[PDB]
Symmetry: C4
Amino acid sequence: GQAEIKPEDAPYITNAYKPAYARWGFGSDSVRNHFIAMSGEFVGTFLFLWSAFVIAQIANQAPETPDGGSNPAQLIMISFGFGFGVMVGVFITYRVSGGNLNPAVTLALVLARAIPPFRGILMAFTQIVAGMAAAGAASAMTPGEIAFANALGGGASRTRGLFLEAFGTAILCLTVLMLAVEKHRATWFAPFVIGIALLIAHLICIYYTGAGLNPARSFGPAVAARSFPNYHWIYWLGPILGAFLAYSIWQMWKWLNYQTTNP
Amino acid sequence: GQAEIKPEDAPYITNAYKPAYARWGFGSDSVRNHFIAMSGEFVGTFLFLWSAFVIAQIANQAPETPDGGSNPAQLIMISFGFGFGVMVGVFITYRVSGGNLNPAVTLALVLARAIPPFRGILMAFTQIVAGMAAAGAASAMTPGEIAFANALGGGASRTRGLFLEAFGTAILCLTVLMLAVEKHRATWFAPFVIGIALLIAHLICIYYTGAGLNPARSFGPAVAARSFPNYHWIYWLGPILGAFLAYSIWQMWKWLNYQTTNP
Amino acid sequence: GQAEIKPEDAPYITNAYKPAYARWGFGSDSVRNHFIAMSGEFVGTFLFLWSAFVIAQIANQAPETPDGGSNPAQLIMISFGFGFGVMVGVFITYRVSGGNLNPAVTLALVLARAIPPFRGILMAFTQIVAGMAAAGAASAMTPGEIAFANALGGGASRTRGLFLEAFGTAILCLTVLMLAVEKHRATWFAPFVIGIALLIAHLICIYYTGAGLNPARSFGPAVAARSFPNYHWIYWLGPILGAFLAYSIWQMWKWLNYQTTNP
Amino acid sequence: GQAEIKPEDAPYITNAYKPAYARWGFGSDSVRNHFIAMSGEFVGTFLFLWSAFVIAQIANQAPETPDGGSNPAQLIMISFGFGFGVMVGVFITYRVSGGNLNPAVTLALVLARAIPPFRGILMAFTQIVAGMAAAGAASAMTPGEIAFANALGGGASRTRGLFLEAFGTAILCLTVLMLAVEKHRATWFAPFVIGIALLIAHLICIYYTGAGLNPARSFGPAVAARSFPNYHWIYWLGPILGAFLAYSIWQMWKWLNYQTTNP
Ligand SMILES: CCCCCCCCO[C@@H]1O[C@H](CO)[C@@H](O)[C@H](O)[C@H]1O
Ligand SMILES: CCCCCCCCO[C@@H]1O[C@H](CO)[C@@H](O)[C@H](O)[C@H]1O
Ligand SMILES: CCCCCCCCO[C@@H]1O[C@H](CO)[C@@H](O)[C@H](O)[C@H]1O
Ligand SMILES: CCCCCCCCO[C@@H]1O[C@H](CO)[C@@H](O)[C@H](O)[C@H]1O
Ligand SMILES: CCCCCCCCO[C@@H]1O[C@H](CO)[C@@H](O)[C@H](O)[C@H]1O
Ligand SMILES: CCCCCCCCO[C@@H]1O[C@H](CO)[C@@H](O)[C@H](O)[C@H]1O
Ligand SMILES: CCCCCCCCO[C@@H]1O[C@H](CO)[C@@H](O)[C@H](O)[C@H]1O
Ligand SMILES: CCCCCCCCO[C@@H]1O[C@H](CO)[C@@H](O)[C@H](O)[C@H]1O
Ligand SMILES: CCCCCCCCO[C@@H]1O[C@H](CO)[C@@H](O)[C@H](O)[C@H]1O
Ligand SMILES: CCCCCCCCO[C@@H]1O[C@H](CO)[C@@H](O)[C@H](O)[C@H]1O
Ligand SMILES: CCCCCCCCO[C@@H]1O[C@H](CO)[C@@H](O)[C@H](O)[C@H]1O
Ligand SMILES: CCCCCCCCO[C@@H]1O[C@H](CO)[C@@H](O)[C@H](O)[C@H]1O
Ligand SMILES: CCCCCCCCO[C@@H]1O[C@H](CO)[C@@H](O)[C@H](O)[C@H]1O
Ligand SMILES: CCCCCCCCO[C@@H]1O[C@H](CO)[C@@H](O)[C@H](O)[C@H]1O
Ligand SMILES: CCCCCCCCO[C@@H]1O[C@H](CO)[C@@H](O)[C@H](O)[C@H]1O
Ligand SMILES: CCCCCCCCO[C@@H]1O[C@H](CO)[C@@H](O)[C@H](O)[C@H]1O
Ligand SMILES: [Cl-]
Ligand SMILES: [Cl-]
Ligand SMILES: [Cl-]
Ligand SMILES: [Cl-]
Ligand SMILES: [Cl-]
C-alpha cells in the first residue's frame, strides 16, 4: 500500500519548496536572517530588473510604428522580459527571501501579516536599491539613450494609467496571495503563476503606461535617466492601490474560510 | 523506507489543490457557500476578461494588414491575453469556485453532474455580470472605440463561424473534464492545461469569429458597444454545442471505465 | 513524521497520471480495451490536427515575405498550433490511449516494446483516419485554398528535408521515450515536454519542409487537397528513421542501466 | 490518514526525477559510468544545439531591419530555439548526465563540488565536440551561408558584450544551482526553469552579442564557418565569469544556511 523512498531521495520530499516567509517564525529577527532576506531580494530584484531592462532596451530599437499604433511582437518581447524575468528571479530566491522583488507585493504580504512590517520595510528598501543598481547597470551596458523608463503612451490619460496600474498590480498581488501565501499542493509552483500574472499585466500596461506595476521598477530608470515625469506618482499610488485591492479580496475569502465547505 | 514530513510542511501535503466543486457535498447549499462560489466566479471572470479585453484593445491598434490578410503577432498577443488570462484567473479561484469563468464550461460540468443545476445557474449569471463589468471597465480605461467585441472576419461565413466556435469550445470543455473533473495526480495542474486549451482555441478562432468560446465574453462587449450583430447567436449556440460535444466524449469514456484495464 | 491525507483527497494520490500503455497488461486484448485505445487516438489526433490545421491556414494568410525570406511571427504561430495542440491532445488522452497521436511515436513505442505490434497497428490506422478527418474538417470550415499541406520551401532539397524530418522526429520520439515510457516522478508531466519538443521541431522544419514529423499529419491534407508531391515519401521515411534513431538511443541507455550508478 | 499506492504505480514515486550528478557517489568512476555521462552530454548537447542552430538559420532569413533596428519576432524565435531547445535536451538527459549541455554550467557545478573535476573535464570536452558536430550538421542541412555564428551587433562594444555574456550566464548557472543542485520538492522541475533562464538570457544577448552563454555553442559554428572574430574570447571569458559569479552567490547562501531559520 506504500511506495518506498530510498534514503538518498528523502531530501526531495522532506525539503519543501516553499517561500521563505512561510517559515519566518521565532528566531527570524537575527541579523543573519535579516541579511539572508535582504540578499535574496537584492539578487532576485537585480537579476529580474536588469534582464528586463536590457530586453526592453532592445525591443524599443524596433522601427517606429506609424500613427501611434501598437507593435504586438515588441509588446510580447517586453512582456516576456518582465514575466519570465520575474519567474526566474522568484524560482531562484523562493527559499531565500520568498522572491517578492516588488515593494507592492511586499506591501500586500505585510497587510496579510505574512511578513512583519520591519522586515517588510527592509525588503522594500532593498528592492528599490536593487532597481537603481539594475537601471544603472542596464544603462552602462547598452548603447543609445535609456529606452526602459516608464512613460504614458497610446493616448492614455494619467487617470486611465493609474487604474490600469492598480488593476494590473492587483492581479499580481492576488496571485502571490492565493498561490504562495496560501498553503497547499500548488504552493511550490507559485513562481510560475506569478510570472504569468506579470506577463499578462505587461500586455495590459506597456502600451499605455510603460508598465510600472512595481515602484522599484519605475524609480530606478527615472534616477538613471535623471528624469521624473510629473505623473510619476501613478507608479507609486497605482501599485499601492492594487496591493490593497488584492489584500481586500484575499481577506474576504479568509474571513469566509473559502477553502472549506463546512467550517 | 519513508521520508519525514516536518509538521510545518504538512499543509503543503494535506491541503489538496483541487477545484472547489470537487468538495461541494453536504453543507454546500448554505448562503455562505453560494456566496463563496459566486465571489470566485465574479473575481476570476472579471480579472480574466478585463485583462484580455484591454490586451485585445491594444493588439487591435496595430497597423491594418492589407487585403484582409492575417497578422500572426497580433493574433498571438490576443491569444496570450485570453489563454494566460484565464490561466491566472483559474489558478487564483480554483479552490474558491473551481474557476469555470465561462457559462459553457459550467454547462459541461452541470451535464457531467460535477456541479448541480441551481449552483450552475448562479455561477453562469455571475459570469455574465462579470463580463459586462469587465467590458465596461475596459472601455472606460482605454482610449478610442471598443475593439474587443466579437465579429466575423477573414472571409468566414456564419455557418463556418458556428462550427469553429463549437469545436474550439469542445476542446476547452474536454480539457476541464479530463484534467479538473477527473481525479488524479495531475488535477492540481489543470489550470495550466485549461489556459493552453483556450490559447489554442483563440489561435483557431480570432481571425474568423473574434473568438467567443464563452457567452459571457461575447455578451459583455456587445452591451458596452451597444451593438449586437444579427449573427450574435453563434456565440451562444456554438459554445453550447461545444459543451455538449465535450460532455458526450467524456460520458462515453466514463461508461467505458476508460482508466482501468480490467474493471 | 507523516502528513495526513483526507479520505476525499486520496484519489489525487492513488490515481496515477500515467500513459495508458503503462498499464496494458493481461486483459488488454479485449474488444473494449482496443476500442478505448482507438477512441483516445481518434479524439486526440483529430482535435490536435484539426486545431493545428486551422491555425496554419490562418497563419498562411499573412502577406507574402519578399525574396523567399522567413516570417518569424508566422512560424511561431504555426509552431504553437502544433506544439500546444499536441500538448492539449496528449494531456486529454494520456489515461485513455497514452496520447501518441502520431504513427512515428507509436512505431518508436512498438520498437521499445511499450506497445504490442497489433495494438500499435490499430493505433496507427486510427491516427491516419483521424488526420484525414481533421484535414477534411479544416478544409470545410475555412475559406480559400488549403494552405496547411506539407511542401518543401526555403530552398531546401528533398535530401535536406528528409534529414530535417528525421532529426526533428527523433527529438519528439526520444522525449516520449525518456519522459512518458520511463517511469519516474516526472512521467505525469510528459505531455508538456512532448508539446515543447514538437514546438521546437516545427521551428526547425516548417520553413523547409512544412514540418511533417507525423505521417498522419502529412497524409490527411494531401488527400483533402487531392495533391501528393512526388517527394511525399520524405514525410514517411523521415519520421520512420527518426523513430528508429530515438529508439536506438533509448535502447543503448537501457542496456547501460543509465539511471543507476551501481547496477 | 494515508492514501494507497498501487504496486504498479510505485515506480512513479520511488524513482526520483533528479539530475544524475546527485547520485554520482562511490562506484561512479567506472568506464561504464563515465560513458553514460558522456553519452548524455553528447546526445543532449547535439540535439539542443543542432535544433537551435537550424532555428537561428531560419530566423536570420527574415528581411533586414533598416537602420540597425531590432526585430522582436526574430529575437523571440531564436530565444525559443535555444530556451526550449535546452529545456527539451535537459529533460531528456536529466537522469543520464544531469543535462549540463554547457561547459560554463559544468564549471559552476565543479566549483560547487556537485561534479568532480575529471568528470567535469570529460563532460566539457564532450559538449564542445557535440557543438562542433551540431554546427557541421546544421550547416550541411540548410541552404545559404551559416547565419548562426556569434557576432557583436546592435552597436555593442566588446566590453559591453563581455558583461552581457557574463551576467546572462550567471542567471543560467544560478538557476541550475538553486533548482537542480539544491535538493527540494522542485528539483524535478529544474529543466523547465533552466530553459526559461536561457530564453531570457537570449532576449538579453542575441541583439548585442549573438548570445554565446556557452563556449560549446560559440566554438562549433566558428569552426564550421572557418571564421573566428578577434573578440571570440568574450564567449569564453564572459561565461566563465558568469559561472564564478553564480557560484559565489550560491556559496554565500550555503555558508549562511539560507534555507533554515534556526540552524
Ligand atoms: C528556547 C525555547 C524557544 C525556542 C523558540 C522556538 C523555535 C521555533 O522556530 C521555528 O521552528 C519551526 C520548526 O519547529 C520552523 O519551521 C521555523 O522556521 C522556526 O522559526
Ligand atoms: C473600474 C472603473 C474604472 C474607471 C476608470 C475610468 C478613467 C476615466 O478616464 C477618463 O475618461 C474620459 C472619457 O470622457 C476622458 O476624457 C479622460 O481623459 C479619461 O481620464
Ligand atoms: C449580499 C450577499 C450576502 C453575502 C453573504 C455572506 C455570507 C456570510 O456567511 C457567514 O460567514 C461567516 C464567516 O465565514 C460564518 O461565520 C457564518 O457561519 C456564515 O453565516
Ligand atoms: C442542530 C441545529 C442546527 C441548525 C443550523 C443549520 C445550518 C446548516 O448549515 C450548515 O452550518 C454548518 C455549521 O455552521 C456549516 O459548517 C455548513 O457549511 C452549513 O451548511
Ligand atoms: C448531521 C450528520 C450529517 C452531516 C453531513 C455530512 C457532512 C459531509 O460534508 C462533506 O464532508 C467531506 C469530508 O468528510 C468534505 O470533503 C466535503 O467538502 C463536505 O461537503
Ligand atoms: C466537421 C464538419 C464541419 C462542416 C462545416 C462546414 C461548414 C460549411 O461552410 C460552407 O461552405 C460552403 C462551401 O461551398 C460555402 O459556400 C458557405 O458559405 C459556407 O458556409
Ligand atoms: C463499433 C465498435 C465497437 C465498440 C465496442 C464498445 C466496447 C463495449 O465493451 C463493453 O463495455 C461495457 C461498458 O464499459 C462493459 O460493461 C462490457 O464489459 C464491455 O463488453
Ligand atoms: C470464467 C469464464 C470467463 C469468460 C469471460 C472471458 C472474458 C475475458 O475478458 C476480460 O473480462 C474481464 C471481466 O469482464 C475484464 O475485466 C477484462 O478487461 C477482459 O479482458
Ligand atoms: C485468472 C487469473 C489471471 C488474472 C490476470 C491478471 C490480471 C493482471 O492485469 C493487470 O493488473 C494490474 C494490477 O495488478 C493492472 O495495473 C494492469 O492494468 C492489468 O493489466
Ligand atoms: C548529420 C549529417 C546530415 C547530412 C545531411 C546533408 C544533406 C546533403 O544536402 C545536400 O547538400 C549539397 C551541398 O553541396 C546540395 O548541393 C544538395 O542539393 C543537398 O541535397
Ligand atoms: C568506446 C567507448 C567505450 C564504451 C564503454 C561502454 C560501457 C560498457 O560497460 C558495461 O556495460 C554493461 C551493460 O550495462 C555492464 O553489464 C558491464 O558491467 C559494463 O562493464
Ligand atoms: C571483489 C572483486 C571485485 C572486482 C571488480 C571491481 C569493479 C568495480 O566497479 C564497480 O562494479 C560494480 C559491479 O559491477 C558496479 O555496480 C559499479 O558501478 C562499478 O563501479
Ligand atoms: C564494498 C563496500 C563499499 C560499497 C560502496 C558503497 C556504494 C555506495 O554507492 C552509492 O549508493 C547510493 C545508495 O546507497 C546511491 O544513491 C549512489 O548512486 C551510489 O553511488
Ligand atoms: C555592473 C556594471 C557593468 C559595467 C559595464 C560597462 C561597460 C562599459 O561600456 C563602455 O561604455 C562607454 C560609454 O562612454 C563606451 O564609450 C564604450 O565603448 C563601452 O565599452
Ligand atoms: C554588512 C552586512 C552584515 C552581514 C551579516 C552576515 C550574517 C552573518 O551571520 C552569521 O552567519 C554564520 C554563518 O551562517 C553563522 O554561523 C552565525 O551564527 C551568524 O551570526
Ligand atoms: C542561552 C543564551 C543564548 C544567547 C544567544 C541568543 C541568540 C539568539 O539568536 C538565535 O541564535 C540561534 C542559535 O545560533 C539561531 O539558530 C537563531 O536563528 C537565532 O535567532
Ligand atoms: Cl527572533
Ligand atoms: Cl446543504
Ligand atoms: Cl487479454
Ligand atoms: Cl568508483
Ligand atoms: Cl508536481
